[PDB]
Structures are given as structure tokens and as C-alpha cells.
Amino acid sequence: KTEEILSKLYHIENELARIKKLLGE
């Protein structure tokens, strides 16, 4: 459920925050 779903989405958004640093921004 919902809470768990959201929580994935934060962890997706942490992965993407590292990704965009590794790239030029």
C-alpha cells in the first residue's frame, strides 16, 4: 500500500539526485 508506494518514490528520487550529480547536473 500507499505509504510503501510513496516510500519507493522517495528512494527513486534519491537514486535520481545521485544520478544527476554523476552527470553534469
Add this chain to the structure above:
Amino acid sequence: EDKTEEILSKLYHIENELARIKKLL
């Protein structure tokens, strides 16, 4: 609509950060 809509919006957010990546590359 709640946690549902926050889930929506954060998906869009993710789609937007991905389309920005894709265009950068």
C-alpha cells in the same frame, strides 16, 4: 485526493526529471 494525489505528483515529478535527463544527454 490525498496520498493518491501525492503519489501522482511525485510520479510526474519523476517523469519530468527523467525527460530532463534524456534531453541533457
Add this chain to the structure above:
Amino acid sequence: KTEEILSKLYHIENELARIKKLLGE
């Protein structure tokens, strides 16, 4: 809802399929 949520997730997965081609794979 659910269906709409999923559908975002396919469109995330199309963005990522283009991304991984643009990169070395």
C-alpha cells in the same frame, strides 16, 4: 488510481529504455 499509477510506471520505464540507449547501455 491504480490503473493511472501503473500507466505512469510504463511511461517511466519508456523514458529509462531511451536513457540507457543514450548511455552506453
Add this chain to the structure above:
Amino acid sequence: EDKTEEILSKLYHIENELARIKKLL
């Protein structure tokens, strides 16, 4: 649990394709 679980699994899928990107870079 249904569409719920498919949503789960495809999140994980996405997290996994992102962690593979992150490690590539």
C-alpha cells in the same frame, strides 16, 4: 495482492534500473 503488487514490482524494477545506471556511471 493484485494491481498493488504489480505496482510494487515495477517500482522495484525501476529502482533496480536506476541502481544499474548509477553503478555504470
